[PDB]
Amino acid sequence: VARYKETSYGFLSRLLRSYGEWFYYNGETLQIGDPEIDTESRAGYDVDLTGV
Amino acid sequence: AFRATLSFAGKEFDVLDCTYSLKRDVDSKGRPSSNIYGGQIRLHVESTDDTSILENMTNQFKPHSGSIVFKKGDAKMKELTWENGYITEFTENIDIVGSQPMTITFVVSAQVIKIGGAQFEQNWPK
Amino acid sequence: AFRATLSFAGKEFDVLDCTYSLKRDVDSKGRPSSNIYGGQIRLHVESTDDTSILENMTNQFKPHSGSIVFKKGDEAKMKELTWENGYITEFTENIDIVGSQPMTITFVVSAQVIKIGGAQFEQNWPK
Amino acid sequence: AFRATLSFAGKEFDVLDCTYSLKRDVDSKGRPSSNIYGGQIRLHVESTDDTSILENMTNQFKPHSGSIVFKKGDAKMKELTWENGYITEFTENIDIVGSQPMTITFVVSAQVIKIGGAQFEQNWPK
Amino acid sequence: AFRATLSFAGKEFDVLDCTYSLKRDVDSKGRPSSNIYGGQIRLHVESTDDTSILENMTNQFKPHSGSIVFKKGDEAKMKELTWENGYITEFTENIDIVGSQPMTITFVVSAQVIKIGGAQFEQNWPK
Amino acid sequence: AFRATLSFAGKEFDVLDCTYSLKRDVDSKGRPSSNIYGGQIRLHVESTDDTSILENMTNQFKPHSGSIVFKKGDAKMKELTWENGYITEFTENIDIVGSQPMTITFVVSAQVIKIGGAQFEQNWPK
């Protein structure tokens, strides 16, 4: 693997996405891989959603 | 001469003015393009020692109901009622000249309003 | 003096005010640059312990027709303003006590055809 | 036959008129979509050789209190007080031809306003 | 019955109206969010064969001072409003053949210092 | 008792109204932030069978000059003069039910205006 004239984020961003991995900041931690989140929610038109 | 009285929160008030209106949207060719919207009620009342209308706007956050009755000869002519409403404007005015100095003006935005054999209902999904 | 009578929904009302108008757009040199638009009738009547205008408005999918008669004095028909395929698109009821004004109703009608005298204006509503 | 008297800056003034109002926001079909805001007090008084309301306004960093007493018979009927307030508008008009000799209009923006058994407060950061 | 006199450029004028105002910006929650601004005096006086207010606006660009004294009772000076370091920023002169005062002049003064009684407003002009 | 006479295009008219004004700009601390602009003269005249002001307007490429003389009581008090000006607005109104059966109001835009020892001049790049 080669790093060619790029930053730390730019190198890791392209390398992990080309291998099909999740790579993002969740709000307090940096997540590498699938977290398997199953939390759900309900939203209704003209109850919670102003526009769709 | 007309007599209009307002029954609100277990009290009686003397009414000076009243209004309510409805509307629709219209295309560029004069064709209606929306549904009926509106139905706010504007009231003008003579102030007194009691301050019940103010405590209903601030101290409470529950919907209420009320009625207004109009008498022409002395007899009952019409009655306008609302249910599931809120007070969204309030104003108290004092003017030391004359002609009813102490007055209160407020606006009610309700879901159902009724007068005579006519009804207006709003779709507030829950 | 004058008198105006409104026949609507199988009933007759007394009319205080009545208005209608039309216009078209023009250039900066004054040449007209559009066609006619805006045939609406504004009516002012007095409310008498009945709610028939309001019931017609809340039935939103029913076009109606109406007519107004102008009388020069006394018993002489002068004009006749008629409409067909119309809807009420504005309604207001006012009550006043301090100013000694009776209960009044103001409303606006937007129709497809309006006629008066030997004149007639129509709008193309697609079928 | 009535009076309004303003007690402010350790003095007494005679009010010509007074007003205050509150408001809420609603959406296209009458459902409230905000909280109550407003609550300023607008006052009209006759100007004598005092120049003390201007002295308080120029003091830009010292809040104050006040009260207005409305009398209907001749005894007190209602009272509108404020606490922790500032003067935010000031106008002096001197008309000679008309019957507007010398008058002052000013607005008060406070944190708490009380009248009767009702009150309204704003959460100013501490 | 009141009287008011304006002492400007070594001359005396008779005042029909006077007004001045101050302002302060307010946050959405009711707190003040700025300091005092404003301090502009609007004056409405009578007109005559002399043109000395217009000369000071046009033919001269220098700061000037002025004074207005209010008299009550037909002696016993009521108040006195003073200004210094000011410029005339508006001017208007009207004549009406029919109706009340024939010839009037209206003008507005924008100054740095304003004194009335025991109150003083000063603007920070950083020079 | 007051009179105003307008001498214009070799004729004399009776003036009902006259106005002129000037202005500057300020920058929210009261300090002037531009130079003086304005200087238009608005006149109101009673029209009598003579369509000669309108012919002057239609002559779009020719400047003119004029004078207005003010007489107080039962002698000249002031004189307003313009030179190198054009008529840039014209209105003629006729009301039968009301008073003022026929009147003309118009505006003049001139390079120089002078009144009683004061003068205002604009620069025109020719």
- Rounded Cα gap, residues C15 and D13, in angstroms: 52
Residue C55: what are its φ and ψ, rounded to 5°? -65, -35
Smallest CA–CA distance, residue A47 to chain B, in Å, is 6
Backbone dihedral region for residue B10 (phi beyond 0: left; psi -120 to 50: alpha; all else: beta): left
Nearest to B97 by CA among E105, F33, E61, D1: D1
Method used for this model?
cryo-EM
User: Considering CB atoms only, which of D97, D101, D123 is closest to E16?
Assistant: D97
- Closest chain E residue to the Cα of D54, Cα to Cα: E119
Interchain pair F19, E93: CB under 8 A: yes
B-C C-beta contacts closer than 8 Å: 81
- Rounded Cα gap, residues F112 and F81, in angstroms: 8
User: Which chains reach chain E with 3 or more Cβ–Cβ distances below 8 angstroms?
Assistant: D, F
* Cβ neighbours of C54 in B, within 8 Å: 115-116, 118
Question: A38 and A51 in contact (C-beta within 8 Å)?
Answer: no
Structure-token pair, residue D9? 């800056």
Residue C52 C-alpha from the chain's centroid: 15
What is the residue-wise DSSP string for D86-109?
EEEEEEEEEESSSS--SEEEEEEE
Amino acid at E81: L
Half-sphere exposure of B37 (CA within 13 A, CB side): 14
Smallest CA–CA distance, residue A40 to chain B, in Å, is 20
Interchain pair B51, D118: CB under 8 A: yes
Half-sphere exposure of D100 (CA within 13 A, CB side): 13
User: What Rg, from alpha-carbon coordinates, does chain F have?
Assistant: 17
Residues forming beta bridges with residue F43, ordered by sequence position:
F18, F106
Residues forming beta bridges with residue E105, ordered by sequence position:
E45, E93
Helix, strand and coil in chain E, % to nearest 5: 5, 60, 35
Contact exists between B and F (3 or more beta carbon pairs < 8 Å)? no
- Say if F77 is an interface residue toward chain E (CB within 8 Å): yes
D-E C-beta contacts closer than 8 Å: 81
Three-state DSSP class for D56? Answer: helix
Interchain pair F19, E89: CB under 8 A: no
Strands E2-8 and E11-23: antiparallel
* Cβ neighbours of B58 in D, within 8 Å: 22, 36, 118-120
Residues forming beta bridges with residue F111, ordered by sequence position:
none
Smallest CA–CA distance, residue F126 to chain E, in Å, is 24
Question: E92 and F19 in contact (C-beta within 8 Å)?
Answer: yes
* Cβ neighbours of B37 in A, within 8 Å: none
Smallest CA–CA distance, residue B2 to chain C, in Å, is 6
- Rounded Cα gap, residues E48 and F72, in angstroms: 10
Residues forming beta bridges with residue F72, ordered by sequence position:
F2
Interchain pair B89, D119: CB under 8 A: no
Half-sphere exposure of E44 (CA within 13 A, CB side): 13
Smallest CA–CA distance, residue E21 to chain F, in Å, is 13
Smallest CA–CA distance, residue B122 to chain A, in Å, is 13
- Say if D121 is an interface residue toward chain E (CB within 8 Å): no
Question: Burial of F97 by CB count in 10 Å (0-12 exposed, 13-18 middle, 19+ buried)?
Answer: exposed
Question: C25 and C16 in contact (C-beta within 8 Å)?
Answer: no
Question: D45 and D101 in contact (C-beta within 8 Å)?
Answer: no
- Say if F54 is an interface residue toward chain E (CB within 8 Å): no
Smallest CA–CA distance, residue D72 to chain B, in Å, is 9
Interchain pair D28, B50: CB under 8 A: no
A-B C-beta contacts closer than 8 Å: 4
Contact exists between E and F (3 or more beta carbon pairs < 8 Å)? yes
CB atoms within 10 A of CB D22: 21
User: Which chains reach chain D with 3 or more Cβ–Cβ distances below 8 angstroms?
Assistant: B, E
- Say if F24 is an interface residue toward chain E (CB within 8 Å): yes
Nearest to E83 by CA among E58, E104, E105, E107: E107
CB atoms within 10 A of CB F68: 21
Question: F1 and F63 in contact (C-beta within 8 Å)?
Answer: no
* Cβ neighbours of C90 in B, within 8 Å: 21-24
What is the residue-wise DSSP string for D3-21?
EEEEEESS--EEEEEEEEE
- Say if E120 is an interface residue toward chain D (CB within 8 Å): yes
Smallest CA–CA distance, residue A43 to chain B, in Å, is 12
- Residues contacting residue F16 through CB under 8 Å, at least 6 positions apart: E96, E97, E98, F4, F44, F45, F46, F103
User: Which chains reach chain F with 3 or more Cβ–Cβ distances below 8 angstroms?
Assistant: E
- Rounded Cα gap, residues C105 and F54, in angstroms: 48
Question: A32 and A16 in contact (C-beta within 8 Å)?
Answer: yes
Contact exists between B and D (3 or more beta carbon pairs < 8 Å)? yes
Interchain pair E29, D122: CB under 8 A: yes
Structure-token pair, residue C30? 């004054």
Element of type H or E holding D57: helix D53-58
What is the residue-wise DSSP string for C24-73?
--B-SSS-B-S--B--EEEEEEE--S--SHHHHHHSTT--EEEEEEEE--
* Cβ neighbours of D16 in B, within 8 Å: 96
Structure-token pair, residue D40? 């300023």
* Cβ neighbours of D69 in B, within 8 Å: none
Amino acid at A27: G
* Cβ neighbours of C59 in B, within 8 Å: none
- Residues contacting residue B126 through CB under 8 Å, at least 6 positions apart: A47
Residue with tokens 């005015």: B93
Provide the H-helix boundaries in F1-126. Answer: 53-58
